[PDB]
Design a protein around this ligand. Sequence first.
Ligand code: 9HY
Lengths: 401, 547
Amino acid sequence: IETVPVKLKPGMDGPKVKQWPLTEEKIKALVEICTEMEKEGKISKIGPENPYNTPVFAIKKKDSTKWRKLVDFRELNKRTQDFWGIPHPAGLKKKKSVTVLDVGDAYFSVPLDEDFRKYTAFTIPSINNETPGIRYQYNVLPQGWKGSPAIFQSSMTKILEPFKKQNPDIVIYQYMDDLYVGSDLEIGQHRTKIEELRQHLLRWYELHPDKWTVQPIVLPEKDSWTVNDIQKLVGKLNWASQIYPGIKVRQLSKLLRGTKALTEVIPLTEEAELELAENREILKEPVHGVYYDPSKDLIAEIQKQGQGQWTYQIYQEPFKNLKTGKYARMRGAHTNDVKQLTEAVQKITTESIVIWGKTPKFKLPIQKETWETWWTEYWQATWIPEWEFVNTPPLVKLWYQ
Amino acid sequence: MVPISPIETVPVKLKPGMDGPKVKQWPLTEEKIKALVEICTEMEKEGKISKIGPENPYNTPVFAIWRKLVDFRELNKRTQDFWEVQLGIPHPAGLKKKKSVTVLDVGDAYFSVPLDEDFRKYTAFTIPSINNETPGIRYQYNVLPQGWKGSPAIFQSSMTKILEPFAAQNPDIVICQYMDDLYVGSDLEIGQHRTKIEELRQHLLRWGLTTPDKKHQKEPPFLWMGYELHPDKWTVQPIVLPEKDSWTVNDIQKLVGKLNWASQIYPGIKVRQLSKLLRGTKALTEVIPLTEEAELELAENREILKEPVHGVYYDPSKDLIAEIQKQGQGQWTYQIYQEPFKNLKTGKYARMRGAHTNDVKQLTEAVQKITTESIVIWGKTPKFKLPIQKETWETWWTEYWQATWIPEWEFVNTPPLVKLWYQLEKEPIVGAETFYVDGAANRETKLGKAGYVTNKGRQKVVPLTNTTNQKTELQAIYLALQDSGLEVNIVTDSQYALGIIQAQPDKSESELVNQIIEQLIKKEKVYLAWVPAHKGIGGNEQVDKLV
Ligand SMILES: *CC(=O)N(C)c1cc(Oc2ccccc2OCCn2ccc(=O)[nH]c2=O)c(C)c2cc(C#N)ccc12
């Protein structure tokens, strides 16, 4: 009911990001949505004296046919002054179950600072560039802007005070327009508790981190090794020696002495079995000196393994993985690589939000033009992370398979 | 007098920390001074400007060419940024045919849009006195001056706000603003159309804006931005390729400009060689001889541009189709249409700069470009016709290490067909000879060696001059492909060669890579395995090639 003064970082002007082309149905959807928002005072039309712009598009969330308006506030978010903070709940990732709730509508009840509104300007584009577009700016806290959860944090504490006083065993975290509620109850009790919390918030996504663990490096167990099997084993052990110090391959490379056929069976000497067993024991231990630094970026690498399987690693320093995983879920994307990749990016970003409370920087195995052409067609999340593109096939792919 | 509705003024500011202009007025001739005095007296009588006192410290130079021309370049440098009047040029193929298209001249409204009063003081200018024996006449603008940075955007936004209720209450017509002209199209009967035109003239007159009753100057065919717009079709303005005994750089840039411009409706335009002659020149007057490939390409262009071709307008009730053909040397051409033999538009795509490539990647990129262009012009993705088999694409994207996707498409049998030229095995081949390859080079003398040893006792080492490590590794793989049967296993330690081959190129800048590709095409089965170097893996002989 009272505006809090907000401004940008020193020396930085507002965002001026080109609006990318939209299909006709997304444009019409945005016209309906923005007309309804203008009737509710949430947004207002602006004149040509506003030079700033932030891209907008439209999506369709899970289990819903209604269109939703998505604003890409990444540039404004990095150009907005730092707000201050709350330490990340390290116990949220340890909880048995976590549920994500969209609390974005609550931001629209708090007005936005007068002098800052011009920086939230966005454009509904026109087909064939016939008009300069329908221009709007926000009058309330917009969804996707980092200042919205920071400004609303006091009100959110006031609303969640009775529930947090009633259940001290439930962990509550907030990130952007999402509320993460972790507990250890049964799925039915968890759903009834989620309905209890949503009806609690009304009058004012099943996720199980316990079923997730870090993935160790495994070596094959065979009774007969071919030359090719041993060559691949030596390669993988040599790659793992960059992570684990004491990895030793000379006794296994001894067996490859001579120019033999790739399919020829080679029996393992006793020294080679001992070396391989020592390597297994070394791989069973965690990596030495692995810590998280909140001042550094999180980097996520994804590899396409084929047959709908994807691998990923989150790290800050090379060979110091903070998280590894394998997303093989099949959900209506059996014939679309890009949809699978987009879903994997969203899942990895969610896990990174749960663990560290921020989003990672992705390295995507895809050409820039394909990704930038198609990723908004399958995006369902409120936030958007940063990404770069790798054009050279990494050799380590099969070593994560 | 009927009361005129006031036009809402746009608040304008200067750039932060800057101040208004203060430019010295040029001395003018007595004749020019008298002319500017008459013109400015008439304009003051009309209300465009107003006289000001000596308190205004700002000044903008004024000229006469009479005609008054104020040079606002300094005030433009000091004026805030505005939202663009346009985010792009409309394309004729996106226009929807109309029974009637009328043109209204709203130029007289340009001077009827008021200027923000707090900003008027920055538009001050001075008419010099005769013999400079009296103080010059001081004026300031009350409306949007021609040449000022914010006049087009404020004028367009004001006109849009004025036209919004008329366009809303008349959804059966189409109103388009372009500079100082309005275009009103409709499928209504000609009488009803002219009627609603009169209604628009009245609605505009309620703000005091005057549309001329005079028969307009613009009429079919509309000539606009190098385009001809007809009632039922569109094309580019006539493209004439000049006959030149010798061609300079600006003649080749004019020719590649005419060909790029003509390529949006004339199918099959190629610009590879002619634009290849402009490589790293940076000399506008330099004369460059024509290669024979440029002559054949230019002859094909003259054959394509011999008689006029037209495009049709967009009909949203029909499907949108885009067909692609490969032209060779990284060139691709495409046609977008809704009815066969009646193109909406055409175009081309040239492969990006790269060391290695294949046809499938280029077809993919072309599909992405056509998709983006089509969403711009028509707001939807077209159905594609591609010269590639379904099984080919499925094999490619299922085995490709990158994620890739092409939207809805169907196979069209139009050679040359995009195909996969080789496919490496997933497992070692039983019964095939195993070639352990290696190569090495000296960094100073550039002397190297490349070779292989096989499980059957076959061996080869070749000495090389003026080579590198990477070159010797590729050369080793090439030698293994040369001297092996139709099925072969190949063991290397070169992460570089594996990085190249795993990208699956069918063409390269390096002749050695192209030779390796030609060898791979001839084989039946090739399995490429990688091992770490210097790890004592026997067979992999670093010493044989470092001698
Ligand atoms: C307004 C605008 O942005 N442009 C690019 C523009 C459009 C024109 O055509 C037009 C205006 C209003 C409604 C419909 C159409 O075109 C539909 C197709 N069509 C074109 C020509 C015709 O005779 N009949 C048709 O059905 C025109 C004509 C322009 C002309 C000029 C000029 N000079 C500039 C811009 C436009």
